[PDB]
Design a protein around this ligand. Structure first.
Ligand SMILES: Cc1cc2nc3c(=O)[nH]c(=O)nc-3n(C[C@H](O)[C@H](O)[C@H](O)COP(=O)(O)OP(=O)(O)OC[C@H]3O[C@@H](n4cnc5c(N)ncnc54)[C@H](O)[C@@H]3O)c2cc1C
Ligand SMILES: Cc1cc2nc3c(=O)[nH]c(=O)nc-3n(C[C@H](O)[C@H](O)[C@H](O)COP(=O)(O)OP(=O)(O)OC[C@H]3O[C@@H](n4cnc5c(N)ncnc54)[C@H](O)[C@@H]3O)c2cc1C
Ligand SMILES: Cc1ncc(C[n+]2csc(CCOP(=O)(O)OP(=O)(O)O)c2C)c(N)n1
Ligand SMILES: Cc1ncc(C[n+]2csc(CCOP(=O)(O)OP(=O)(O)O)c2C)c(N)n1
Ligand SMILES: [Mg+2]
Ligand SMILES: [Mg+2]
Lengths: 169, 155, 582, 582, 155
């Protein structure tokens, strides 16, 4: 049991762009709501927003928008949440890096980097034991590489989870 | 002072994890996690000493669902942190973000007449560049994933 | 102008900064179980006489005393526990105040901040334990921002859905000395984005544009009218809607006027369920629309058009889908409802006599009767006996269970907050300690209390708190040797057995267990024991003139069961018609 | 296995599974309190003739009873409760069971799944409030999980670092009909992947080699050897390394021999303080280096090398880091340590008694001494003569404070599972329901139970539950009319400021309050008020004369102090042999 | 709501096809087709409900020459739509179409002093970007092929 599994989405799969303070426990107050609302969190990726002092959590919740409306205002019941944005009913960028170490030999490393050249995956680190790709983009390109690198000697797929902003276009 | 966590079959896996930095009072510098139906690989940097890092690499193993915690800090890592910055795309000042996204070598996913969205990816040294260098243009909304690390494995 | 106890530029122990910031909100009574780790705050209390320590005998009793002092004043009550295990005992009452929307503040000590969460001594990381069950928590790490978060706590206690704020302070924080920088603003940037603005009459137009469209209205009021003293009564004075008061709203509408529908729902009055399950516009003023009032989400007034006014935005649409929905502080928006609709007082409908005729024929056809099987006192009589004797208004506390609704369906309440309830939490053990907090919110006023046989005993420690504080609590113990709620939940769910319902001793089941006379006489309190109706009016007569507190002990008949009771996910078609324990 | 009271090949209810799920884990007693959702277990808990539910009154007293029945068994206790308040009062005993490492299973009836999240009825989010204070918790979602949950639960509670486990079973899940595969094996790959191995033998000599360069070692036992009858004492019988227990380390060594030192630490005995600080070899054996032990972070055995062995990997070096460490179950880690030393018999003596007699000259010099002030009975005398009245076989239970301390530094605890207290937590109100559980795990032991001024009254809920069960809960009272530990805090630290540390009415100062004899008369127990030198052992003689329970109101002086008491986080030189109350 | 059609040996194959959206009154959102001596693969998106899409995937098989109609909408497709935009190449405003064709990553086939011609290719989300983002510069004449789809085939 080495690799992280394939994909982080179902049919429902709403995305909420949280916008919280930079409290040291502010993740646990936010996923504390996803737990206490009985929601599985399908994917999550936190980080510091544009005003240094607040954070930004981009979540993936398998819940229909009726139940998400029972969450977006429910996440407002938290103190540190400045805003939530239900991006899922909007067009939105969906970029997610995915660091995929793959154990390969010499000749098979040729037949991996070309696939990494297809996805514009910068092969960030290589050895003779292995090569570690780093692709980025939508989750379909994430799952396409992992569906295509399962033929190869994959290792710890250190993903990062769907990160989103609703495009204005 | 960074930690990779591999966890098993539960829901709200993060709540076990993000609890036991808060209830242990040891602040996370950043976090991100590729959750799935039963597997998830956290990558948590905790701004603390190596003494308290030695606690939380094992105190996170006081949790049950954790299959593996490895302090990845000592290894030569590949810290790669994505940052989907949405920048104000005013063409008086868009005209230099062109190369100032080519320098950081990032795609630009969606453009409007006043909002373009870039995809800066990689070393947090390069990420804190963009958070400062492209701060000189008015930033709409930075969203960034957490820093993700892996072993640059040799034997 | 605040009367400062010390100099404004005295670098002193943070508990002095803390205890001044309590009175700087304008509070007067704490509930402070003493501190092996919250030590300085009781010490800094003792250098104050504006604040009062009602030291409980148990911290769960303490937070329920902080519950009772909150919901018999409206001023945000303050408990203080010792760190760790004392703070674990708040977790009962903090789960009440988030569920029952009670403005609470829980100050608590923590350990030294160099020892927080280290599996240390006297420690429970209660800021992270009660993250899920409070409105906000705090783990302040400096002396200079102690009253930052305190005024923010009393902001968060008062504002929105009034929740509890566990405010923690580390033991070495108050043992660190600094100057109190008092007037700093609310570090509270996200909460001002939903600090609920007054909803104007343009938003209230599509209510009053549907009031005339409403032929069959019902006034589903509850804990949002907890501040509406007469504003709801002014609203029904304007337009005349038959009420439907829930448990934290029992009192809000004074339940003795013409539309005297006491309590609705699955355990309510059956003729108020008739008032709610036959409406075409479910008008709601501050309710949380729970399972045990609605049954089904889609069938609870399915033929109605729900409107729902709340200070809480998240509550809107949480359990029940609203047809048209408007947020906003109800008592504020009722002052922006009744004191603006007088332009429409010759325009509006007022045509509800044909809807007042439905309740009148079903008031008596769906009665509040009982069964006097011999002389074993119906407690449903004994609360109608209570308002026959308690001279009208009476601040009443309850435990929870079958003896909870006996207060609800059978007392004529006259004012909100002259009534206590663990309704949403269902906190067994609420009764006797809510009698404490009401006896310092309204000390000279009649703090009557009714408890069940377990929920009294479950928090019976606080009998000793009374004699220390000379409180005139008037507790009535509705004893039936039985878990009185779920023994009906044997019968109307699955089977008429006696599976662990019997609280009493099976060696003396006919005798009283435990002897509450020798409970109150153990703490020197006077008591009584009633089983016959002739002494029932006698014992209450001895109760309301007793100097200081009084106990009594009615005997609920152990096989008496209350209408209605539906399984969860039910309608008024699935009402029970006459269910007993025999 | 055992006898199946249920058809092994037939799909039935979750209630059919749940009580059998414990019955397929050898459970004989649960401390189940029924409720709005927990009653469905009680529908089937009566059906288990094996598991007699000791019904509590307070579920906090229930969950404290799942510690006395745990830490007097080795088997984990089980407390079943309900959502809302029943779940939010486990959190005392759960935080007790987390810190002192008490194995426990907290079953809890949860809200139905459609009504989960929405806080419809009394949904405290239990696995979201108790995620901290338990080792693990399980909101189950399907009934087929419940056997592999509960097999994991008793795996997680008993094995590993033995902590509490909670299980949330929803009300519809217990009603749901499914199949009880006990051989649905544990899908718990994380815990068993580093469920700690037996320590390797060459690592064990490295401790023995460290004795050779340590003429001054000291054995520092904690609750690790609570699973060892003689396996610790035999090691000291093998090798002359002097014992020095901690508070939960009491009982584990037989603390009545002539080598026997006592509980060390801040309120631990000073003739155990010299042994730990002048030493060279801390044998930290199953103990977690607490802050009532270290005093200062560095001045705890700074001139000593430390071996710290424990069943937790993570607890090793959580405080100041040892030199050599196994992650061994110390019940097993001794049983390879003793293996080499019966083989390597006497080429190294390791019985340098002059370091033992460096403290056997201090065994008398700084003893367990005090002064009797007046003809009234002094407090720690009565617990002292209690030991000689009870042969040291009496499993104590206590609350927190002086009657934890004066219980600790005087009594001779022969067997382990004999000192039954909330330690690192310090849950007051513990002992009276701790003895309730201790009256089941050792149901024919003479379970005397010292309580205190406050910690008696805090859980006199369970005084009812003695009378319903007729247990030898021989409730000693170290009442001194004042919460004396924090009075002992207040004089030696801050100005002796009485912040109602006196429990009783201060207008009733010179009298006994409460008259807790009638608490025993409230249920049916007899009692005893001991106030003078004239009845020192006399009522305690009648205590063991009376079968079943008893109460012994040993009222003590209203000012007393525990000696020693180092300052909080203080240096070793500020050990004392004083008391300043008179 | 998009359809791929493979047709056989006839001339004016489109007239059978583009008829039976007009004479059925169901509007085509776009169309393109690689005709040959006997083969042609249409790719037709029809802005209608899935009910009327179910009609025209079979009503186009009421035509005879259609070898195959497959509603490709449910599949993960690759919608790639070329757009040979001729843009006014004035060097005061040409200077930013440089990167604003590099962002969309398109060749520029022919340039004049007042007219350059780009070759934007791919996702119609990216195509409606260019139709809006490069509309802010004065567009001479957009010509675009229709959206073309294929199966992202896996088993
Ligand atoms: C066993 C049992 C059975 C019960 N059966 C019934 C029954 O059959 N029928 C019944 O009615 N009750 C019943 N109850 C009581 C019920 O659980 C609670 O009373 C109810 O869920 C909460 O009361 P509420 O929703 O009206 O107001 P609350 O929930 O206490 O607060 C009012 C709600 O509106 C909003 N609000 C809060 N504060 C304000 C404010 N200052 N201004 C404006 N809006 C505000 C809040 O969002 C809040 O959710 C029962 C309780 C138990 C334990
Ligand atoms: C008011 C008050 C004053 C106190 N004063 C003192 C004092 O002066 N001196 C003192 O010593 N205590 C004192 N205590 C108790 C103190 O708080 C701790 O409870 C005490 O340190 C208990 O010992 P322990 O926690 O270290 O060992 P444990 O109670 O057993 O704590 C568990 C630790 O020991 C280990 N352990 C448990 N099970 C096993 C096993 N099967 N195998 C191996 N290891 C195991 C656990 O893994 C963990 O490391 C006081 C408590 C209170 C409330
Ligand atoms: C600790 C706890 N257990 C169970 C419940 C559910 N519950 C509430 S009341 C009740 C029985 C009622 O007994 P009591 O409160 O003494 O009053 P009674 O109806 O018997 O007069 C039960 C089982 C609860 N709220 N709390
Ligand atoms: C639940 C809880 N409340 C408060 C404390 C703090 N505390 C520890 S000991 C003590 C004194 C109370 O002891 P008591 O029961 O009055 O008998 P005593 O030891 O004083 O003789 C206090 C207030 C605690 N550890 N736990
Ligand atoms: Mg009762
Ligand atoms: Mg005391």
């Amino acid at each position: 049991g080495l690799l992280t599994d394939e994909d982080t989405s179902g049919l429902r799969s709403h995305t909420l762009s949280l916008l919280v303070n930079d409290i040291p426990g502010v993740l646990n107050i936010v996923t504390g709501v996803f737990a206490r609302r009985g929601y599985n969190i399908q994917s999550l990726a936190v980080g510091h927003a544009e005003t240094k002092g607040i954070s930004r959590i981009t979540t993936v919740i398998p819940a229909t928008d009726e139940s998400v409306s029972k969450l977006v205002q429910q996440l407002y019941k938290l103190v540190d949440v400045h805003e939530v944005h239900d991006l899922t009913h909007l067009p939105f960028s969906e970029r997610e890096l995915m660091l995929i170490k793959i154990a390969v030999n010499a000749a098979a490393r040729r037949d991996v980097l070309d696939i990494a050249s297809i996805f514009r995956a910068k092969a960030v680190d290589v050895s003779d034991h292995t090569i570690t790709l780093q692709l980025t983009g939508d989750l379909d390109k994430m799952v396409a590489l992992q569906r295509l690198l399962e033929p190869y000697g994959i290792c710890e797929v250190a993903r990062t989870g769907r990160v989103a902003l609703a495009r204005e276009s | 002072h960074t930690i990779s966590v591999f966890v098993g079959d539960e829901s709200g896996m993060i709540n076990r994890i993000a609890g036991v930095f808060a209830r242990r009072g040891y602040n996370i510098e950043s976090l991100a996690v590729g959750l799935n139906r039963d597997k998830a690989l956290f990558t948590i940097v905790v701004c603390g000493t190596e003494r308290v890092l030695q606690q939380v690499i094992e105190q996170l193993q006081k949790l049950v669902n954790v299959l593996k915690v490895e302090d990845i800090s000592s290894e030569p890592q590949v810290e790669r942190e994505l940052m989907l910055v949405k920048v104000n795309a005013h063409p008086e000042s868009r005209a230099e973000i062109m190369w100032l996204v080519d320098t950081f070598r990032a795609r630009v996913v969606d453009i409007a007449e006043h909002a373009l969205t870039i995809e800066v990816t990689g070393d947090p040294g390069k990420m804190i560049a963009v958070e400062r260098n492209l701060k000189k243009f008015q930033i709409r909304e930075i969203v960034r994933t957490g820093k993700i690390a892996l072993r640059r494995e040799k034997m | 102008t605040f009367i400062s106890r010390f100099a404004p530029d005295q670098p002193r122990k943070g508990a002095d900064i803390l205890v001044e910031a309590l009175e700087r909100q304008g509070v007067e009574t704490v509930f402070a179980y003493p501190g092996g780790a919250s030590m300085e705050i009781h010490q800094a209390l003792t250098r104050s006489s504006s604040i009062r320590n009602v030291l409980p005998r148990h911290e769960q009793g303490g937070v329920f005393a902080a519950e009772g002092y909150a919901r018999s004043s409206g001023k945000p009550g303050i408990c203080i526990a010792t760190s760790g295990p004392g703070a674990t005992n708040l977790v009962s009452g903090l789960a009440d105040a988030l569920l029952d929307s009670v403005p609470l503040v829980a100050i608590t000590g923590q350990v030294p901040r160099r020892m927080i969460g280290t599996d240390a001594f006297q420690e429970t990381p209660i800021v992270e334990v009660t993250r899920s069950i409070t409105k906000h928590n705090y783990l302040v790490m400096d002396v200079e921002d102690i009253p930052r978060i305190i005024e923010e706590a009393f902001f968060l206690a008062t504002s929105g859905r009034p929740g509890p704020v566990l405010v923690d302070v580390p033991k070495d924080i108050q043992q660190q000395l600094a100057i109190p920088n008092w007037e700093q603003a609310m570090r509270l940037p996200g909460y001002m984005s939903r600090m609920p603005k007054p909803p104007e009459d343009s938003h209230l137009e599509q209510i009053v544009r549907l009031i005339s469209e409403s032929k069959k209205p019902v006034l589903y009021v509850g804990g949002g009218c907890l501040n509406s003293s007469d504003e709801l009564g002014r609203f029904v004075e304007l337009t005349g809607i038959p009420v439907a008061s829930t448990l934290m709203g029992l009192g809000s509408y004074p339940c003795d006027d013409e539309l005297s529908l006491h309590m609705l729902g699955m355990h309510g009055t059956v003729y108020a369920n008739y008032a709610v399950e036959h409406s075409d516009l479910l008008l709601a003023f501050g309710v949380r629309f729970d399972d045990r009032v609605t049954g089904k989400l889609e069938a609870f007034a399915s033929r109605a058009k729900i409107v729902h006014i709340d200070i809480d935005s998240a509550e809107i649409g949480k359990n029940k889908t609203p047809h048209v929905s408007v947020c906003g502080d109800v008592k504020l928006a009722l002052q922006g409802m009744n004191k603006v609709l007088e332009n429409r007082a010759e325009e509006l409908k007022l045509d509800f006599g044909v809807w007042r005729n439905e309740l009148n024929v079903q008031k008596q056809k769906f009665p509040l009767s009982f069964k006097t099987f011999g002389e074993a006192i119906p407690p449903q009589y004994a609360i109608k006996v209570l308002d026959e004797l308690t001279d009208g208004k009476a601040i009443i506390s309850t435990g929870v269970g079958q003896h909870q609704m006996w207060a609800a369906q059978f007392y004529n309440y006259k004012k909100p907050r002259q009534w206590l309830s663990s309704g949403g939490l269902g906190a067994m053990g609420f009764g006797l300690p809510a009698a404490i907090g009401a006896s310092v919110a309204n000390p000279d006023a009649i703090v009557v209390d009714i408890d069940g046989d377990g929920s009294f005993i479950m928090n019976v420690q606080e009998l000793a708190t009374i004699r220390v504080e000379n409180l005139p609590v008037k507790v009535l113990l509705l004893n039936n040797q039985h878990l009185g709620m779920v023994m009906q939940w044997e019968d109307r769910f699955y089977k008429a057995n006696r599976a662990h319902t019997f609280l009493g001793d099976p060696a003396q089941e006919d005798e009283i267990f435990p002897n509450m006379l020798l409970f109150a006489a153990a703490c020197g309190i006077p008591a009584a024991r009633v089983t016959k109706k002739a002494d029932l009016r006698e014992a209450i007569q001895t109760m309301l003139d007793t100097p200081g507190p009084y106990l009594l002990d009615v005997i609920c008949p152990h096989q008496e069961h209350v209408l209605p009771m539906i399984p969860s996910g039910g309608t008024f078609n699935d009402v029970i018609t006459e269910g007993d324990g025999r």
